[PDB]
Structure 1
Amino acid sequence: KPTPDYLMQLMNDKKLMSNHLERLLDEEISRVRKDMYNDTSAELPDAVGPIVQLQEKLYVPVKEYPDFNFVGRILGPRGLTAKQLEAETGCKIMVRGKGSMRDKKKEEQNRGKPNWEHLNEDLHVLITVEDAQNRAEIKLKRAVEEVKKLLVPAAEGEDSLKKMQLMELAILNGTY
């Protein structure tokens, strides 16, 4: 029974609590939320060959569409959207690049510092996998073919997804 209200009555169930009890909740929460969006499926082959790591830097077109905030849409509230995506694909999703950090200031200092090399590239979405080739290509190409969706600006009033998160946010905020 993945209802909106009862979901709000779940987050608060979780607010007061925080060894299986927690996990018990995290499952449904995710399961609810998944069902929320899925109202808007193949299976991986058995591993073949030595383990491989696959990346795909996917740049966001702020050069093309500066005004639109892609990044938020992707990450979502508590970064959950980005979190549910790593979950259902297996690929490590992470936002790197120029302007990654919301703050312009903090970013203006980490340049060159190890593991901040990525700050010298234009803004992108990084998608990494560790798995056997035939099993990873699929994993990758699943998440690849999903960020591209998020790298396409649904005009306001038609971005159903935007409202989805924004209501989720306004619940974590408790302002609604």
Structure 2
Amino acid sequence: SHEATVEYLADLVKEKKHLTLFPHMFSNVERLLDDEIGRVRVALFQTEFPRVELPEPAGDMISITEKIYVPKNEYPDYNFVGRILGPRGMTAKQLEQDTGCKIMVRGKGSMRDKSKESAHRGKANWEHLEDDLHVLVQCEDTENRVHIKLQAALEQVKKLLIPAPEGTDELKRKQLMELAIINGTYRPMKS
């Protein structure tokens, strides 16, 4: 396997732009190239969280939701939500999958556009806007699995609520790098 660098991915993409013009003549080799582009993307941008080992289901079904406030006040300038979510919410999805939980960002300043927020305030079904910015972590499994999963996701969400000093944020950098590619380049290179 060729080293996964951004420079390489760019190379593969320019090739993919040309190769896809002849989808029939080159059907097999386009698939091969899609494979390699996919592999290189995963190695570059995808950061993965530890997966935990679970017993087979046994006991009652339990749904459990923990609320963890984001230390927005203590660190007023740090963008915690953006780093938890990731480009297209990819990081949150990765976390959801790896831990078997559901991640939901809620409370004041949780809406993408803070202007629209001020309108829903008080209204029914939006009562969480009265609360401070928090992450809800939620797992539903059987009595002998649900708490294992939860604790796995809690440990990760808590890590992400500790802001990283300048130039040490490996997670953030991968995110921003991918993001630059998404909205700096055209269609054949994003997603």
The TM-score bracket by the shorter chain reads 0.7 to 0.9
- Structure 2 residue matching 1:37: 3-state secondary structure: coil
What does residue 24 of structure 2 align with? none
What does residue 98 of structure 1 align with? 108
Q: 2:97 aligns with which of 87, 111, 118?
A: 87
CA contact under 8 A between 1:52 and 1:132: conserved in structure 2? yes
Larger Rg: 2
| Alpha-carbon distance between aligned partners in 2 of 1:129 and 1:34, rounded to the nearest angstrom | 29
Following superposition of structure 1 onto structure 2, how do residues 69-148 of structure 1 map, counting pairs within 5 Å? 69-148=79-158
Q: Unpaired segments of 5 or more residues in structure 1?
A: none
Q: 2:175 aligns with which of 155, 165, 171?
A: 165
Following superposition of structure 1 onto structure 2, how do residues 23-102 of structure 1 map, counting pairs within 5 Å? 32=42, 36-38=46-48, 41-102=51-112
User: Which amino acid counterpart does residue 53 of structure 1 have in structure 2?
Assistant: S
| Alpha-carbon distance between aligned partners in 2 of 1:34 and 1:81, rounded to the nearest angstrom | 13
More helix by share: 1
Change (3 A) 1:38 1:129: closer
Q: Deviations over 1:55-109 (max 9, x none)?
A: 1011100121111111111111111001111111111101011100132210001
Shift of 1:38: 4.8
Shift of 1:135: 0.5
The alignment's C-alpha RMSD in Å is 3.1
Q: Unpaired segments of 5 or more residues in structure 2?
A: 21-30
- Structure 1 residue matching 2:92: 3-state secondary structure: helix
User: Which amino acid counterpart does residue 109 of structure 1 have in structure 2?
Assistant: A
Change (3 A) 1:147 1:167: same
CA contact under 8 A between 1:51 and 1:132: conserved in structure 2? yes
Q: Deviations over 1:113-163 (max 9, x none)?
A: 333111111000011111112201011101100011100010121111111
- Structure 2 residue matching 1:173: 3-state secondary structure: helix
Change (3 A) 1:174 1:105: closer
Number of aligned residues: 164
